[PDB]
Amino acid sequence: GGNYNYLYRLFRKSNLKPFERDISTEIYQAGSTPCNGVEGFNCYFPLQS
Amino acid sequence: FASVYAWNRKRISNCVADYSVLYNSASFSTFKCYGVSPTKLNDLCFTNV
């Protein structure tokens, strides 16, 4: 099997409803005060293989 | 500060300090903690530090 073909979506603060589909593969960023006090930082890729 | 092999230790207790005043400060290279929420630390009570 694929070495890095299996991944999980690291996330927080937005508790989700059970039994729903997530296809919004977007890198997490805020661009406001609660991310290093600036815009564009803390832009870590949520998916971990 | 002391050396890496002879670091200093101090006892701190009965304090009321806010973790939000330091999280937003940009004078830190990085602020990543293992299992400790930087945002929710303001609502946490600890036996000792």
Curated annotation (Swiss-Prot), chain A:
Effect of substituting residue 48 to N: Reduced host ACE2-binding affinity in vitro
Gene: S
Region (Receptor-binding motif): 1-49
Name listed for the protein in its UniProt record: Spike protein S1
Impact after mutating residue 45 to L: Increased resistance to neutralizing antibodies and human covalescent sera neutralization
Subunit description: Binds to host ACE2. RBD also interacts with the N-linked glycan on 'Asn-90' of ACE2. Cleavage of S generates a polybasic C-terminal sequence on S1 that binds to host Neuropilin-1 (NRP1) and Neuropilin-2 (NRP2) receptors. Interacts with host integrin alpha-5/beta-1 (ITGA5:ITGB1) and with ACE2 in complex with integrin alpha-5/beta-1 (ITGA5:ITGB1). May interact via cytoplasmic c-terminus with M protein. May interact (via N-terminus) with host bilirubin and biliverdin, thereby preventing antibody binding to the SARS-CoV-2 spike NTD via an allosteric mechanism.
Functional description taken from the UniProt entry: Attaches the virion to the cell membrane by interacting with host receptor, initiating the infection. The major receptor is host ACE2. When S2/S2' has been cleaved, binding to the receptor triggers direct fusion at the cell membrane. When S2/S2' has not been cleaved, binding to the receptor results in internalization of the virus by endocytosis using host TFRC and GRM2 and leading to fusion of the virion membrane with the host endosomal membrane. Alternatively, may use NRP1/NRP2 and integrin as entry receptors.
Mutation effect (residue 30 to V): Increased resistance to neutralizing antibodies
Disulphide-bonded residues: 35-43
Reported effect, residue 7 to R: In strain: Delta/B.1.617.2, Epsilon/B.1.427/B.1.429, Kappa/B.1.617.1, Lambda/C.37, 19B/501Y, Omicron/BA.4, Omicron/BA.5, Omicron/BQ.1.1; Contributes to cellular immunity evasion and increases infectivity
UniProt-reported outcome of changing residue 7 to Q: In strain: Omicron/BA.2.12.1
Location of the region described as Immunodominant HLA epitope recognized by the CD8+ in the Swiss-Prot/TrEMBL record: 3-11
Region (Disordered): 10-45
Effect of residue 48 to Y: Reduced host ACE2-binding affinity in vitro
Result for mutant: residue 7 to R: Increased resistance to neutralizing antibodies. Decreases HLA binding to NF9 epitope. Increased binding affinity to human ACE2
